[PDB]
């Protein structure tokens, strides 16, 4: 882990969520790709994975497999909480052989309508927070920026600015991140994806 | 830990301290190191707590099955079960056990299973980290036949010295007497044995 | 035998247009245990120079007392000539490099006014490399403060609305009150997110008048 | 020097409105063997200083000999060596800290944790800490080694900040110290039942209490614990 | 990390803090450590949080199946045996240190379980990094005759001491009371003494501050 | 060690491979499909074993379906194989470049797969330290609408820079071109 | 860290970045990696910052003493050999240093020496020492000639630093340029790497792979 | 391996065994672990033989100079010399030393100097590897103001137990009595203390 | 890494030294030789920094002796001095990791001389020699083609063959070679090799 770089941050607003990530992929100091997206979505739930890129791709494929089978069997899209439990169980199934990843789940429950964000450790310990979740090689800078900037009950327009500023300023202080950023603003029925202009790229 | 078991005229007497330490910190000060594996067969455990507890539970299960099938097991049978468990898994266990029981053999019986899983039958046995300081004393104040009160006094003096000179031993002194009348449990507090 | 240790502090130096601010936490700890809740690390060494060494407490105290002795001897040997901030920085560099092979396990920040009257902050590494900066945080919470200062002092990654990111937000003069507010917010965030950070914040302000002290309470009182 | 052989135990201390109280046990443990008893670890210096030493006891004897030599040296050619030019806790602590730091810098440390307690000539209570590596700090309550983890939380319940110091009487502080010693004897495997206690008061002076014993212990409930299931 | 259990004349009480950290960084400030094994058998864990959660859930499911099979109320001795055998089988690799309290038709019980598989019985127990301060408080202020209020206050005071004196503990206090003859009472955030206090400034960026390259719409719904 | 480079130009994929094995006529390539080639580098004969295994699987698929796989599917299959390999005993230390022309979309494609199983699909890529000595030129003299001859000249410049500025003598280079007609070898 | 320096008809061009990182965290982005030995000598900082600063200031003092005693400006070779002899005494003690001593003298023209902590001292035309030295050296080798003007040489240095900063994660917070002539050094300002990247991409059609 | 010193009523008696082992093999079956420093004030040493012999020679030379120059040394002076020699060479020697002496003023003094260089007086002292097995017994059967014969019996019993329960300890039992009468040497053979 | 070759003919000594100073490649025109005396030349290889310092120290000592005595040291004496210095350094705190070839022309006997010395202090007088791993590749050619009675041109041709073999065989690119010739007229450097 910590050889490819990458940072993801999720925040909860008023009837909406935001999830942003960097785009750098590299082999230690050398930069390889500036288009390596680390955010995926199944149904209406979004997942960001930091750490080893191979494990990120493997987990994305496995979770797409499981979510498609779930939709076929239950005739219903999976909710963020059930997906969080599934991810935690899958991560714990690899005890002593863990995937070197940091996962973060975001989304709005279709039925209840409230936002939901959560994070996972190496072996699938669920960390549910009502304000923000951070992951990556710049987690300390992300924690500082989120603690300084975040406010409860933010409109999507203000939430986008807050999360973008936090991500950009955290990435500018990390050597293994900052080759482009992408932000998802997720509402009850509409999702907006935006690319950010930043230095070093 | 300081543990001992001595045979006397009416049976056998087991004595133990009540201190369990994690490094230099006393995790438990009311530990009960006297374990019952049959109605009149008891064992004293020293070493790793988890290993000793698991071995005691397995021996208790085996002796219960033996009682259901065959009747009343002898103390030698319990010692043999302990020996098999300790010797088969000597590479992954740290347990020193003293098996004391009263049966038709009379005068009590004491077996010792030290590290390695060996078996030795002795009139009296001492074990634990605190026993090293009370060896010579116990070799100068032991007699083959003694009454109940004299044996209790001997145990109290030996364990008092062991607690005094060993930092890994402390707390209250717990004693178990196995005789034809049954099982008796005795507690001696630091205000009593710190003098005699 | 390990001749080093960590006491877990956090300091921050910010240079203004005509002032300097050096702030620090007052918690001294070792291996999840709190040695003291009020152990000051920022000292007035004289000549309007304020010095703070963070990290190994013993090495920091030794460096501070050696620098004070050096200032005293400089006053003695040069007819009480005032020591400039750059001269003090070079002297501290020589002091640090004198024991490079047995280095002090500290990070040093000094603050004052330059010969033109503007705020000056100098940062040092353990083996004696120094540079003049405008904002520098040291300690275990430095990674949780510097991005916030970059965003809120240098206005990095900020652009004027309505220009679609074509005109950067211009730099603006900040009074001492704004610097104090930013320092307090950064230290509050560090206290929130760092176990080793936060029992009380001590701030020293250096101007032409002299050095003044302020204190504020943090969590774990 | 490189590893301690015969080691002491926790030393605890706190400040009350008129002075300082410092206590320490009398054990000379040799690892897991309680080899030596009746070892005094509170060294009185002058009529106003008490030094408590924890750790290697050979180094304790070395630095107590150093303190005796310092007291002898302070009286040389000093007509006011007992009125106004007498030693103070601050001077003694500075000398001890300098010695400890110099020993650390040569990679030949004194394996000790030292608490200096006393009353200054102006009536201010002095209580400071030093150890190997030369790390120094001060606090209204201090404790070395094991007592740093158990005695400090209790004492801080009485004196939590500086403003609590004027509100604490000598009786309350002494009761807290005795309770902390009882807890340490409860939970420390290298502790002893006997301890010494020194009180330095601006008015009364130095009061030394030796051969104290831990009492009012609780062991009755242990009769109700049997087995482990 | 500080977990305390205290028995009183009519049951047991368990309490814990709500801080979860990874290294010196505080990850979760309102983590829940009181895990429910059965409706009247509860447990609090220290060490690896994932291991504690997984083992508690597995043992709870097994004990629920056993209760359905035997048509009898579950007993905490069965849970203790299952936990100890599991941990011994895994030889301490599952880093869970548990305090298990419960009320069954045989009475109120309180046990402590270590990672390697050793169990201890007592009238008051403490585990975690702040376990020494909590143990000191328990030794100072415990007696045989305790009502529910006295036990709750003693557990809360021990947790508060662990919070104030241990760097690995902090935030809030959660308390579960068993109280034989009644339903188990869970009190999450029973004490909240660690508020953040208001900041000195508002940090709401103006709209249009961030430069955007491309904006699109995701077909997700 | 060994130099593997690849450039994707507007209607072609150019692959350059070192010819030194520590022999001077070493072909570190395997034709997976009539429109898909793969170059491999890294450790010892494990690379040849992995390449032959992948080639056999792809040939079996083509025989069964009578329809060649797209370059994206081949790259995904290779990435899956490497990801499975790393998580088991006896892993493969093979870094590969896959160049293929998609006939359905009529477009060249180049994929870079690490030994751990990381796939990027860069417009131009390299494996080893050869990226250090070439990526500047590729960052300065590459366009998405370049022709085959311009790509060949750029590759010539990169190879000359590698020869001049690298202490290791890799004994020339062998160049393959993948386009609509298939795979050809440049004899220059 | 790239810290390149080359010679041309107009003298010497020295170009450095300003990024200092510790444990993948960027400690500073305003680090001065050029040391002004005297009004006629410059040095480059690579390896240990403290060693470079301390010993190059010491070298400046030694050069001042030499010029005071001999009433003549010291040559670049003499100062470089003094520094190399000083460093060779401390070999094996853990010093880390890579420096380019660049100077324009009347006798020797423009001269660049490379001196490392291992005791190596060699005179050359183009030098690049750092984590991202390869990209900058490649750019220089592709676009070097003993015919460039001052402006072209400055732009070449900026372009090489920009390439190194883009392709190396440990390099690039700003670009600092210096022009060494027979009358001393001239400082050509500090240029932000982020703005320079966009400016170069807009002017020259390079970096097509980056979306802007 | 088993060394002891007791002050009863009229002087001090120091006892020791005579087994020196270079591992499991007994290098010297009968060794004299009691070494004279002065006419009075001399006792036995444990630990490494070479270090103890060197320290004993140095202490004997120093006390010879002290006797020649400043009168007659006390027991505490010899204890201080031993303490200085052990403490200054803390990382260089591993001896362990008990020093016993007699003089008219105090009538029997004992000083224990373990590893690390610390010094303690104590009424009686035990040291060595075998002494670990006699800590309780010596604590249960020591009284102040005993007669010479009672002291001999107590030392004999304690050393016999140490010899029995320690593999590396025990040949014959050597005793030295220092009183106002003079210096007396006693030896007890295995057939005596084993029965 | 560094190729140091030496051959001896009936009236001359030919020395060849590589140009690469790679440590990424910095210089391709390094002259790894020092002129000890007008008839004695030294070629060196080994650890960075040590080689130049050792060569300059030897040159300074030889020049000081020549100025003091107004006489030129024979090649054997210079080789003995270098070997003694290396043997003294081998047991010092910081030994030199330097291997040297000495090529001289004894005017008293009118005869070329070649000496090979390692950092340990083993000195050998050989018709030809090499330092490093170039010996493994050039020893066959030197054993099969060398003759005691050879001219400068034949030696140059043999050196060209050896250099071509090294280029064809060595995995490391030493980037050419510099050749110097020592004879009765002194030391000369050839061009277009």
Curated annotation (Swiss-Prot), chain D:
Task: Describe, as the record does, how this protein assembles with itself and its partners.
Answer: The 26S proteasome consists of a 20S proteasome core and two 19S regulatory subunits. The 20S proteasome core is composed of 28 subunits that are arranged in four stacked rings, resulting in a barrel-shaped structure. The two end rings are each formed by seven alpha subunits, and the two central rings are each formed by seven beta subunits. The catalytic chamber with the active sites is on the inside of the barrel. Interacts with CIC1.
UniProt record similarity statement: Belongs to the peptidase T1B family.
Q: What are its GO biological-process terms?
A: proteasomal ubiquitin-independent protein catabolic process; proteasome assembly; proteasome-mediated ubiquitin-dependent protein catabolic process
Q: Which UniProt keywords apply?
A: Cytoplasm, Nucleus, Proteasome
Question: Which region is the signal sequence?
Answer: none
Q: What else is known?
A: Present with 16900 molecules/cell in log phase SD medium.
Give any Pfam family that matches: Proteasome
Q: Which domain of life is it from?
A: Eukaryota
Where does the UniProt annotation locate this protein?
A: Cytoplasm; Nucleus
Annotated protein name in UniProt: Proteasome subunit beta type-7
- Is Cell division included in the keywords of this UniProt record? no
Origin species, per record, is: Saccharomyces cerevisiae (strain ATCC 204508 / S288c)
According to its record, what are the GO cellular component terms?
A: cytosol; nucleus; proteasome complex; proteasome core complex, beta-subunit complex; proteasome storage granule
Name of the gene this protein is made from: PRE4
Give the main location. Answer: cytoplasm
Swiss-Prot record, chain F:
User: In terms of one coarse class, where is the protein primarily found?
Assistant: cytoplasm
According to the UniProt entry, where is the signal peptide? none
Phosphoserine occurs at 70
Question: Is the keyword Cell division in the record?
Answer: no
Record keywords, A-Z = Acetylation, Cytoplasm, Nucleus, Phosphoprotein, Proteasome
**A Gene Ontology biological process annotation?**
proteasome-mediated ubiquitin-dependent protein catabolic process
List where in the cell it is found. Cytoplasm; Nucleus
Q: Which domain of life is it from?
A: Eukaryota
Q: Which residues carry this modification: N-acetylmethionine?
A: 1
Q: Which GO terms describe its molecular function?
A: endopeptidase activator activity
One GO cellular component assignment for this chain's record is: nucleus
Any matching Pfam family:
Proteasome
The Swiss-Prot or TrEMBL record describes its family as follows: Belongs to the peptidase T1B family.
Q: How does it assemble?
A: The 26S proteasome consists of a 20S proteasome core and two 19S regulatory subunits. The 20S proteasome core is composed of 28 subunits that are arranged in four stacked rings, resulting in a barrel-shaped structure. The two end rings are each formed by seven alpha subunits, and the two central rings are each formed by seven beta subunits. The catalytic chamber with the active sites is on the inside of the barrel.
- Remarks, miscellaneous: Present with 21800 molecules/cell in log phase SD medium.
| Function, as annotated | Non-catalytic component of the proteasome which degrades poly-ubiquitinated proteins in the cytoplasm and in the nucleus. It is essential for the regulated turnover of proteins and for the removal of misfolded proteins. The proteasome is a multicatalytic proteinase complex that is characterized by its ability to cleave peptides with Arg, Phe, Tyr, Leu, and Glu adjacent to the leaving group at neutral or slightly basic pH. It has an ATP-dependent proteolytic activity. This subunit has a chymotrypsin-like activity.
From Swiss-Prot, chain H:
Is 4Fe-4S included in the keywords of this UniProt record? no
Write out the annotated subcellular location: Cytoplasm; Nucleus
In terms of SUPFAM superfamilies, this protein maps to: N-terminal nucleophile aminohydrolases (Ntn hydrolases)
Catalyzes what?
Cleavage of peptide bonds with very broad specificity
> Coiled-coil regions in this chain?
none
Q: How does it assemble?
A: The 26S proteasome consists of a 20S proteasome core and two 19S regulatory subunits. The 20S proteasome core is composed of 28 subunits that are arranged in four stacked rings, resulting in a barrel-shaped structure. The two end rings are each formed by seven alpha subunits, and the two central rings are each formed by seven beta subunits. The catalytic chamber with the active sites is on the inside of the barrel.
Q: What's the protein here called?
A: Proteasome subunit beta type-1
Q: Could you state one GO cellular component term attached to this entry?
A: cytosol
- In short, the EC number is 3.4.25.1
- Mention one GO molecular function: endopeptidase activity
Encoding gene per record: PRE3
What InterPro entries does the record point to?
Ntn_hydrolases_N, Pept_T1A_subB, Proteasome_bsu_CS, Proteasome_sua/b, Proteasome_suB-type
Keywords annotated in UniProt? Acetylation, Cytoplasm, Hydrolase, Nucleus, Protease, Proteasome, Threonine protease, Zymogen
Q: What else is known?
A: The side chain of Thr-1 acts as a nucleophile, and the N-terminal amino group acts as a proton acceptor.
The UniProt similarity line reads: Belongs to the peptidase T1B family.
Q: Main subcellular localization, coarse class?
A: cytoplasm
GO-annotated biological processes: proteasomal ubiquitin-independent protein catabolic process; proteasome-mediated ubiquitin-dependent protein catabolic process
For this protein, the record's Pfam families field holds: Proteasome
User: What lineage does UniProt assign to this protein's organism?
Assistant: Eukaryota, Fungi, Dikarya, Ascomycota, Saccharomycotina
Q: Which Gene3D superfamilies match?
A: Glutamine Phosphoribosylpyrophosphate, subunit 1, domain 1 (3.60.20.10)
UniProtKB/Swiss-Prot annotation, chain I:
A single Pfam family it belongs to is Proteasome
Q: Which SUPFAM superfamilies match?
A: N-terminal nucleophile aminohydrolases (Ntn hydrolases)
Q: Where in the cell is it found?
A: Cytoplasm; Nucleus
Q: List the disulfide bonds.
A: none
Highest taxon of the lineage = Eukaryota
State where it is primarily located: cytoplasm
Any one Gene Ontology MF annotation carried by this entry is: endopeptidase activator activity
Phosphoserine modifications at: 74
Return the InterPro entries for the record.
Ntn_hydrolases_N, Proteasome_beta2, Proteasome_bsu_CS, Proteasome_sua/b, Proteasome_suB-type
Q: Which UniProt keywords apply?
A: Acetylation, Cytoplasm, Nucleus, Phosphoprotein, Proteasome
The chain residues annotated with the modification N-acetylmethionine are: 1
Q: Which CDD domains match?
A: proteasome_beta_type_2
Q: Which GO terms describe its biological process?
A: proteasomal ubiquitin-independent protein catabolic process; proteasome-mediated ubiquitin-dependent protein catabolic process
Q: Name one GO cellular component term.
A: proteasome core complex, beta-subunit complex
The protein's job, in short, is: Non-catalytic component of the proteasome which degrades poly-ubiquitinated proteins in the cytoplasm and in the nucleus. It is essential for the regulated turnover of proteins and for the removal of misfolded proteins. The proteasome is a multicatalytic proteinase complex that is characterized by its ability to cleave peptides with Arg, Phe, Tyr, Leu, and Glu adjacent to the leaving group at neutral or slightly basic pH. It has an ATP-dependent proteolytic activity. This subunit has a chymotrypsin-like activity.
Quote the record's miscellaneous comment: Present with 21800 molecules/cell in log phase SD medium.
Similarity annotation: Belongs to the peptidase T1B family.
- What name does this protein carry? Proteasome subunit beta type-4
> Which source organism does the UniProt entry give?
Saccharomyces cerevisiae (strain ATCC 204508 / S288c)
Organism lineage: Eukaryota, Fungi, Dikarya, Ascomycota, Saccharomycotina
């Amino acid at each position: 882990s910590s050889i490819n770089g990458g940072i993801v941050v999720a925040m909860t607003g008023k009837d909406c969520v935001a999830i942003a990530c960097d785009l750098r992929l590299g082999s230690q100091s050398l930069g390889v790709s500036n288009k390596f997206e680390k955010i995926f979505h199944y149904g209406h739930v979004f997942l960001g994975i930091t750490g080893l890129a191979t494990d990120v791709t493997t987990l994305n494929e496995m979770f797409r497999y499981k979510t498609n089978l779930y939709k076929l069997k239950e005739e219903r899209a999976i909710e963020p909480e059930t997906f969080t439990q599934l991810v935690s169980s899958s991560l714990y199934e690899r005890r002593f052989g863990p995937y070197f990843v940091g996962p973060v789940v975001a989304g709005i429950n279709s039925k209840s309508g409230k936002p939901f964000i959560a994070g996972f450790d190496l072996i699938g310990c669920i960390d549910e927070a009502k304000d923000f979740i951070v992951s990556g090689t710049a987690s300390d800078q992300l924690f500082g920026m989120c603690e300084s900037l975040y406010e409860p009950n933010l409109e999507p327009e203000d939430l986008f600015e807050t999360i973008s500023q936090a991500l950009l300023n955290a990435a500018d202080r990390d050597a293994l991140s900052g080759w482009g950023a992408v932000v998802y603003i997720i509402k009850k029925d509409e999702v907006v994806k935006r690319y950010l202009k930043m230095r070093q790229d | 830990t300081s543990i001992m078991a001595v045979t006397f005229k009416d049976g056998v007497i087991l004595g133990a301290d009540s201190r369990t330490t994690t490094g230099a910190y006393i995790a438990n000060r009311v530990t009960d190191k006297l374990t019952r594996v049959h109605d009149k067969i008891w064992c004293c455990r020293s070493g790793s707590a988890a290993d000793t507890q698991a071995i005691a539970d397995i021996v208790q299960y085996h002796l219960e099955l033996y009682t259901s099938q065959y009747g009343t097991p002898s103390t030698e049978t319990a010692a043999s079960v302990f020996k098999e468990l300790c010797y088969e898994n000597k590479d992954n266990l740290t347990a020193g056990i003293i098996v004391a029981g009263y049966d038709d053999k009379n005068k009590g019986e004491v077996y010792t299973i030290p590290l390695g899983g060996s078996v030795h039958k002795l009139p009296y046995a001492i074990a634990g980290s605190g026993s090293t300081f009370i060896y010579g004393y116990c070799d100068k104040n032991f007699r083959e036949n003694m009454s109940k009160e004299e044996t209790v006094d001997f145990i109290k003096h030996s364990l008092s010295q062991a607690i005094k000179w060993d930092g890994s031993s402390g707390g209250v002194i717990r004693m178990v007497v196995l005789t034809a009348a049954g099982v008796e449990r005795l507690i001696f507090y630091p205000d009593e044995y710190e003098q005699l | 035998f390990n001749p080093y240790g960590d006491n877990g502090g956090t300091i921050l130096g910010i240079a203004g247009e005509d002032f300097a601010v050096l702030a620090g936490d007052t918690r001294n700890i070792t291996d999840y245990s709190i040695n003291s809740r009020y152990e000051p690390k920022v000292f007035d060494c004289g000549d309007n120079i304020v010095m703070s060494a963070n990290g190994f407490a013993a090495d920091g105290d030794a460096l501070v007392k050696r620098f004070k002795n050096s200032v005293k001897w400089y006053h003695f040997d040069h007819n009480d000539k005032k020591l400039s901030i750059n001269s003090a920085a070079r002297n501290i560099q020589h002091l640090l490099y004198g024991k490079r092979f047995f280095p002090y396990y500290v990070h040093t920040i000094i603050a004052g006014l330059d010969e033109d009257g503007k705020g000056a902050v100098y940062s040092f590494d353990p083996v004696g490399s120094y540079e003049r900066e405008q904002c520098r945080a040291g300690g275990a919470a430095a990674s949780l403060i510097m991005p916030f200062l970059d965003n809120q002092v240098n206005f990095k990654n900020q652009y004027e609305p309505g220009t679609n990111g074509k005109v950067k937000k211009p730099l603006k003069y900040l009074s001492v009150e704004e610097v104090i507010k930013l320092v307090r917010d950064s230290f509050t965030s560090a206290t929130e997110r760092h176990i080793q950070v936060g029992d009380g914040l001590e701030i020293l302000i250096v101007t032409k008048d002299g050095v003044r002290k302020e204190f504020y309470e943090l969590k774990r009182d | 020097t490189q590893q301690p052989i015969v080691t002491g135990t926790s030393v605890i201390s706190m400040k009350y409105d008129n002075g300082v109280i410092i206590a320490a046990d009398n054990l000379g443990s040799y690892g897991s063997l309680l080899r030596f008893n009746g070892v005094e670890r509170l060294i009185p210096v002058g009529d106003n200083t008490v030094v408590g030493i924890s750790g290697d006891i050979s180094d304790m004897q070395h630095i107590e000999r150093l303190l005796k030599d310092l007291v002898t040296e302070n009286a040389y050619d000093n007509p006011l060596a007992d009125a106004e030019e007498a030693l103070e806790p601050s001077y003694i602590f500075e000398y001890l800290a300098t010695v400890m730091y110099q020993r650390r810098s040569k990679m030949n440390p004194l394996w000790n944790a030292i608490i200096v307690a006393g009353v200054q000539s102006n009536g201010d209570q002095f209580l400071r800490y030093v150890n190997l590596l030369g790390v120094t700090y001060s606090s209204p309550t201090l404790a070395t080694g094991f007592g740093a983890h158990m005695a400090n939380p209790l004492l801080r319940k009485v004196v939590d900040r500086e403003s609590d110091i004027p509100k604490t009487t000598v009786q309350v502080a002494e009761e807290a110290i005795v309770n902390a010693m009882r807890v340490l004897y409860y939970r420390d495997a290298r502790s002893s039942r006997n301890f010494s206690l020194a009180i330095i008061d601006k008015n009364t002076g130095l009061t030394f209490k030796k051969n104290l014993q831990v009492e009012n212990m609780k062991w009755d409930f242990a009769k109700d614990i049997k087995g482990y299931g | 990390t500080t977990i305390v259990g205290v028995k009183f004349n009519n049951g047991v009480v368990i309490a814990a803090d709500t801080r979860s950290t990874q290294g010196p960084i505080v990850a979760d400030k309102n983590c829940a450590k009181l895990h429910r094994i059965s409706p009247k058998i509860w447990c609090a864990g220290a060490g690896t949080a994932a291991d504690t959660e997984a083992v508690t859930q597995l043992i709870g499911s097994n004990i629920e199946l056993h209760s359905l099979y035997t048509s009898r109320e579950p007993r905490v001795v069965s849970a203790l045996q299952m936990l100890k055998q599991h941990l011994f089988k895994y030889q301490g690799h599952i880093g869970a240190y548990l305090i298990v309290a419960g009320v069954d038709p045989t009475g109120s019980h309180l046990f402590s379980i270590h990672a390697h598989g050793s169990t201890d019985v007592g009238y008051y127990l403490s585990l975690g990094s702040g376990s020494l301060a909590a143990m000191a408080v328990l030794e100072s202020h415990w007696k045989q005759d305790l009502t529910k209020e006295e036990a709750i206050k003693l557990a809360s005071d021990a947790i508060q001491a662990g919070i104030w004196n241990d760097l690995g503990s902090g935030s809030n206090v959660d308390v579960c009371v068993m109280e034989i003859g009644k339903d188990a009472e869970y009190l999450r955030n029973y004490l909240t003494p660690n508020v953040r206090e208001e900041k000195q400034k508002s940090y709401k960026f103006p709209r249009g501050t961030t430069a955007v390259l491309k904006e699109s719409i995701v077909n997700i719904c | 060690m060994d130099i593997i480079l690849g450039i994707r130009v507007q209607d072609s994929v150019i692959l350059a491979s070192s010819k030194a094995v520590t022999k001077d006529s070493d072909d570190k390539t395997r034709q997976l499909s009539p429109h898909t080639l793969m170059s491999f580098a890294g450790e010892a004969g494990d690379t040849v074993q992995f390449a032959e295994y992948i080639q056999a699987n792809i040939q079996l698929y083509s025989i069964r379906e009578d329809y060649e796989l797209s370059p994206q599917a081949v790259s995904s299959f290779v990435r899956q194989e490497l990801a499975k390999s790393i998580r088991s005993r006896r892993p493969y230390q093979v870094n590969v470049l896959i160049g293929g022309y998609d006939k359905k979309k009529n477009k060249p494609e180049l994929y870079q797969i690490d030994y751990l199983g990381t796939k990027v699909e860069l417009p131009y890529g390299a494996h080893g330290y050869s990226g250090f000595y070439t990526f500047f030129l590729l960052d300065h003299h590459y366009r998405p609408d370049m022709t085959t001859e311009e790509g060949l000249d750029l590759l010539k410049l990169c190879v000359q820079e590698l020869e001049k500025r690298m202490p290791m003598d890799f004994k020339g280079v062998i160049v393959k071109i993948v386009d609509k007609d298939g795979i050809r070898q440049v004899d220059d | 860290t790239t810290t390149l320096a080359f010679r041309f008809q107009g003298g010497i061009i020295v170009a450095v970045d300003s990024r200092a990182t510790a444990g993948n965290w960027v400690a500073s982005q305003t680090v001065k990696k050029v040391i002004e030995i005297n009004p006629f000598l410059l040095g480059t900082m690579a390896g240990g910052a403290a060693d470079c600063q301390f010993w190059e200031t010491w070298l400046g003092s030694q050069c001042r003493l030499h010029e005071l005693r001999e009433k003549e400006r010291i040559s670049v070779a003499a100062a470089s050999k003094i520094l190399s002899n000083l460093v060779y005494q401390y070999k094996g003690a853990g010093l880390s240093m890579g420096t380019m001593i660049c100077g324009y003298t009347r006798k020797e023209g423009p001269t660049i020496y490379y001196v490392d902590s291992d005791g190596t001292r060699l005179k050359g035309d183009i030098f690049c020492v750092g984590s991202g030295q390869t990209f900058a050296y490649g750019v220089l080798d592709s676009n070097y000639k003993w015919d460039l003007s001052v402006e072209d040489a400055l732009y070449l240095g900026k372009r090489s630093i920009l390439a190194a900063a883009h392709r190396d994660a440990y390099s690039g917070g700003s670009v600092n340029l210096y022009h060494v002539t027979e009358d001393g050094w001239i400082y050509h300002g500090n240029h932000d790497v982020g703005e320079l990247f966009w400016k170069v991409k807009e002017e020259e059609g390079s970096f097509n792979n980056v979306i802007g």
